[PDB]
Symmetry: C3
Subunit: 130 residues, 3 copies
């Protein structure tokens, strides 16, 4: 499958899959931001994508940063719908009780996966079969 | 074209729906009013039960707007709905804001439900990699 | 459906092999290899005593256990944890106590997470100057 991607911010590298078989491509921060303990920010990644119909984009936290500094994503896994053509934004939060997180423009702050989704049709029933 | 059987345990709420074609999830409603003080959690009823087909999994995800705007999260995200489960879907909401309480009223949309295939892998112990 | 195998190594042989508790359950439970106490707001990187070989074309996903999320506010900082197809190391779980007041005590042999395996689309990114110009312009 291909994923069309617009670099809204041309100063950042194109997201790339570091190893073959890696699930995600890393997303970059377009901005310098400091998160005090317990505080959050909505951070621009400088990209937009066109997730194919029948698929979903998923924004996951990076594991390294998660343990080392307690960086997380409030709405994790972030859900990118097929019809979304805006900028991908990452709702970062510092879950460390005492130390700030310094995020720089150019840092890898999340990863983007693409998977198939079942666009189920909901059928209301009165009860389930037992 | 897969169908997802659903029961409104709470008949007074709208049926969950896909806002646009292609959207991965359907929004779940709260059946209840809840106030979450900063850092507190609550297990909130949605008024629905579903029948995830065998070979698939139900996934409860946070909504992006409330996440940023008020710091609303889900403790066990992504909430895993197994194919054998036929009880009420409940959402473990938590307030990750430091100072501002979160108000949820009955009828608010508090989460989204995705359905995916899952690989029901058979584990095989090996000596080494 | 009929799936494949997942090769698994018990780096810690005193723990039980993860298993699927019921036939169509999405996940298998992972165990803690360690005793650890998490004070309110504190996290730890907890060893599970296992390594896996997620098939190429797939991803392993580490999800929190719902039960403990509710009873005690246990969560996973990088949820869902992403286990890449090429990883052969030990699976570790970034546990965090989201309760404001009660410590969480984790014992060796306790179930601390679940592991799912799914297909993933190993997309090839194609840069386009704009969606409008690409014919892709909710
Ligand atoms: O909950 C997890 C998540 C990941 N991992 C392992 C598997 C994976 O392939 C690797 C890296 O994960 P990720 O890409 O999320 O973190 P990173 O900070 O980007 O580290 P790396 O440079 O190793 O990718 O670490 C775990 O043991 N447990
Ligand atoms: O981490 C994320 C998650 C979402 N989005 C964008 C993509 C997506 O299609 C849209 C809506 O996300 P979601 O459906 O989670 O939020 P909502 O509060 O339910 O908004 P909506 O009313 O637009 O569905 O916002 C992001 O940029 N980053
Ligand atoms: O956000 C969620 C997550 C799970 N469940 C339901 C679905 C699922 O199949 C069941 C899990 O029950 P169980 O008591 O087996 O949980 P556990 O064994 O403590 O952990 P897990 O749910 O992670 O298997 O509860 C929900 O209603 N909402």
């Amino acid at each position: 499958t291909t994923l069309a991607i617009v670099r809204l911010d041309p100063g950042l590298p194109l997201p790339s899959r570091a190893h073959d078989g890696d699930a995600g491509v890393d997303l970059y921060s377009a901005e310098d931001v400091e998160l005090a303990p317990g505080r959050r920010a909505l951070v621009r990644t400088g990209v937009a994508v066109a997730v194919p119909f029948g698929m979903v984009g998923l924004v996951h936290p990076r594991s390294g940063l998660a343990t080392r500094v307690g960086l997380s994503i409030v709405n994790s896994p972030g859900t990118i719908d097929a019809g979304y053509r805006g900028e991908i934004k990452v709702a970062l939060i510092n879950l460390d009780p005492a130390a700030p997180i310094v995020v720089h423009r150019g840092d890898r702050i999340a990863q983007l996966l693409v998977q198939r989704v079942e666009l189920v049709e909901l059928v209301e029933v009165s009860s389930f079969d037992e």
